[PDB]
């Protein structure tokens, strides 16, 4: 009879082997007492950090797919306090969600949701939630902004980077950003706010440290939101997974005194020469991990406040996501695999 179709990740050979068609949900009710049922209007796609699922270790054969959701509240459990039916909310499904985001209705814990401000549409908001929060995480908790500090956004041209740059400009930061394609440099040219400099790694010569340092004129860069590090493949199998990431050492010299390096790279080898370089420069090293708020979820209130303020930024127009043209649900799986391979630099959103 009535059925709701949900895509499911399969756990095999530790990573990179996700596949299956969406499987039915039959007669799903709104059981539990803090989980609300949504008419899902939009679901954003993100590359699944599968290795994190594996070390996180839940034992499912099928994992729910889709986590960045916007929709309308159909009904609530009895203990629900902040939400009423017909309300319009947006949010991140938890990493250990029972229900997939690739489905037109969803049962979700109420404190993963925030109300949608009236000015923003469904698809933009839903495509902005995840990069808005990891960026806001990067620039306001791990690294502490204030106007006048210099911020380096490496691979700022990507979908995440646009929100990182616009957050930094919104906080009065001066931004140096790295672009990989010529077209990505063109996108940095296309920014309505004028960024301080565009630094190009497109050429075979890599001049990230030297050129970026002379942009700060020897003062140095305070906040480097580096996307990745080229470390541990320098002498063995260069460019693993065809990566032309920045070298660790050029970044570490590049960091200014008292600076903040916020890094994404999961396996980081800090050599004693490097830790002496940081010791001399009094630098802080912080690790960016968005999903600490769902899996560990200790400071749930802080994060919940973050999302609504991110929406207040979206309502003011500070954020503008890098959306692709939205897609129907049944074509998402064919897209998802390439999204699973790499980001397309355009945010892909399923609209309902």
């Amino acid at each position: 009879h009535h059925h709701h179709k949900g895509l499911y990740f399969q756990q095999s050979s530790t990573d990179e082997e996700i596949t299956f068609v969406f499987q039915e949900k039959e007669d799903l009710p709104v059981t539990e007492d803090n989980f609300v049922k949504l008419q899902v209007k939009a679901c954003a796609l993100s590359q699944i950090n599968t290795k994190l699922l594996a070390e996180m270790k839940m034992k499912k054969d099928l994992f729910p797919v889709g986590r960045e959701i916007a929709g309308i509240v159909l009904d609530v459990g009895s203990k629900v306090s902040f939400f009423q039916p017909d309300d319009e909310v947006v949010g991140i499904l938890p990493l250990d969600s029972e229900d997939p985001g690739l489905c037109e209705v969803v049962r979700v814990h109420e404190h993963y949701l925030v109300h949608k401000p009236e000015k923003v549409t469904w698809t933009e908001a839903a495509g902005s939630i995840r990069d808005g929060v990891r960026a806001y995480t990067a620039l306001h908790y791990l690294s502490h902004l204030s106007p006048g500090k210099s911020v380096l956004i490496m691979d700022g041209a990507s979908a995440f980077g646009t929100i990182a740059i616009q957050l930094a400009h919104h906080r009065g930061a001066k931004v140096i950003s790295t672009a990989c394609s010529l077209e990505d440099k063109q996108c940095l040219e296309r920014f309505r706010p004028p960024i301080a400099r565009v630094i190009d790694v497109s050429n075979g010569k890599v001049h990230v440290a030297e050129s970026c340092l002379e942009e700060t004129g020897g003062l140095g860069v305070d906040i480097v939101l580096d996307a990745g590090v080229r470390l541990y493949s320098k002498d063995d199998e260069p460019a693993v997974k065809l990566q032309l990431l920045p070298h660790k050492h050029d970044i570490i010299t590049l960091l200014g005194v008292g600076g903040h390096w916020v890094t994404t790279e999961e396996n980081l080898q800090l050599d004693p020469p490097d830790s002496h370089c940081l010791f001399l420069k009094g630098a802080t090293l912080a690790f960016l991990n968005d999903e600490v708020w769902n899996l560990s979820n200790v400071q749930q209130g802080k994060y919940l406040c973050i999302l609504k303020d991110v929406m207040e930024k979206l309502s003011t127009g500070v954020f503008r996501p890098q959306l692709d043209e939205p897609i129907p649900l049944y074509e998402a799986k064919v897209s998802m695999e390439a999204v699973q391979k790499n980001q397309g630099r355009k945010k892909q959103v399923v609209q309902f």
């Binding site: 340092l213 020897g218 320098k234 002498d235 063995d236 200014g256 005194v257 020469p273």
Partner: protein, 33 residues
């Protein structure tokens, strides 16, 4: 001050004495003995 700090990091910069062998080294140390 500004010239002093610029002089500070120009003094501070050291060449890339590349050393990331840990992942193989963990096996290497034990097998060598």
């Amino acid at each position: 001050y500004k010239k002093k700090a610029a002089a500070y990091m120009k003094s501070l910069r050291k060449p890339l004495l590349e050393s990331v062998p840990y992942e193989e080294a963990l096996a290497n140390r034990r097998i060598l003995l």
